[PDB]
């Protein structure tokens, strides 16, 4: 006779909580210019096979992102006023619980 | 006789909570110009096969993104006023729970 | 005799909650110009096969996105006023629960 | 005799909640000009096969998107007023639950 609980599990399991606030580029003040380039991706492919006495000129006018600001003139005040700023993050949650029970009762 | 609970699971399982606030480029103040380029993607392909005494000129006028601001003139005040700013994130939730029970009762 | 519970599962399972607020480019103030280019995608293909004494000029007038602002003149005030700003995120939910029971009762 | 519960499932299953607020380009104030280019896609194809002493000029007048603002003049005030702004997100829901039971009762 055999009365068994057998656990031969292969457990590559993931349990994850991400709770609260995640801010990128918050509260950026510029008197003249604010320039932001966020996560540009370039996956361009260029192939150039040149034969005998051949000529290839790969000369695009610019790259992926070009941002330009010029000739800004301010005569009077440039000002920012904030009376109060509160950045509150309260995380009572984000709890992980993993339970595994094996109970064998024999009579 | 055999009375068995057998667990031979292959557990590559994912449990995940993402709870609360995620802000990118929040509260950006510029007196003259705000320029934002967000996640441009370039997957362009160029192929240039040039034969004998051939000529290829690949010369596009610009790249993917060109942003330009010029000749801005302000005589009087340039101002921003905020009386109060509250950024509140409350996360009581986002809880993960994983339970696994094996119960064998024999008479 | 065999009385069995057998679990030979292949569990590549995904359980995920995404709860709350996600803001991109919120509250952007510009006195002169605001220029935003959001997620441009370029999947253009160019093929240029040039024969003997041939000539190819691939010269498009510009790339994908061109944004331009020029010659803006302000004599009097340029102003923004906000009395109060509240950004509140409350996430009591977003809970994940995964339960797996094996119960064998023998008489 | 065989009394069995057999679970040989191949579980590549997806359970996901996305609950709350998702804002892109919210609350953008520009004194002169606001220029927004949102998710332009270019899948253009150009093929140029040039023979002996041939000539190809691929010269389109511009690329996909061209946005231009020029010569704006403001004599008096340019102003924005908001008395109060509330951005409230409340997510009590967005809960995922996955239950799997195996019950074998033998007499």
Author numbering:
A (entry chain C), B (entry chain A), C (entry chain B), D (entry chain D): 273 to 379
Authors' own words:
Mutations in MAPT, the microtubule-associated protein tau gene, give rise to cases of frontotemporal dementia and parkinsonism linked to chromosome 17 (FTDP-17) with abundant filamentous tau inclusions in brain cells. Missense mutations of residue P301, which are the most common MAPT mutations associated with FTDP-17, give rise to the assembly of mutant four-repeat tau into filamentous inclusions, in the absence of extracellular deposits. The other three isoforms lack exon 10 expression and have three repeats (3R). These repeats and adjoining sequences constitute the microtubule-binding domains of tau. Part of this sequence also forms the core of assembled tau in neurodegenerative diseases, indicating that the physiological function of microtubule binding and the pathological assembly into amyloid filaments are mutually exclusive.
Two types of tau filaments, each made of a single protofilament, were present. In type I P301T filaments, the core spans residues G273-R379 of tau and adopts a new fold, in the shape of the letter V. It has a four-layered body and two-layered wings. The N-terminal half of the core sequence (residues 273–324) forms the inner side of the V-shaped fold with a sharp bend at the R2-R3 junction, whereas the C-terminal half (residues 325–379) curves around this bend on the outer side. The conformation of the R2-R3 junction in type I P301T filaments is different from that of type II P301T filaments, but it is almost identical to the conformations of the R2-R3 junction in filaments from mouse lines expressing human tau with mutations P301S or P301L. Missense mutations in P301 stabilise this conformation by creating an additional hydrogen bond to the main chain of an adjacent molecule. The side chain of T301 is on the outside surface of this common substructure and makes a solvent-mediated interaction with residue S352 of R4. The type I P301T fold also displays local similarities with the corticobasal degeneration (CBD) and AGD tau folds by sharing with them the substructures 312–333 in R3 and 337–357 in R4. In all three folds, residues 312–333 form a compact semi-detached unit, whereas residues 337–357 wrap around the R2-R3 junction. However, in the type I P301T filaments, the substructure from R4 makes interactions with the R2-R3 junction that have an inside-out conformation compared to the CBD and AGD folds.
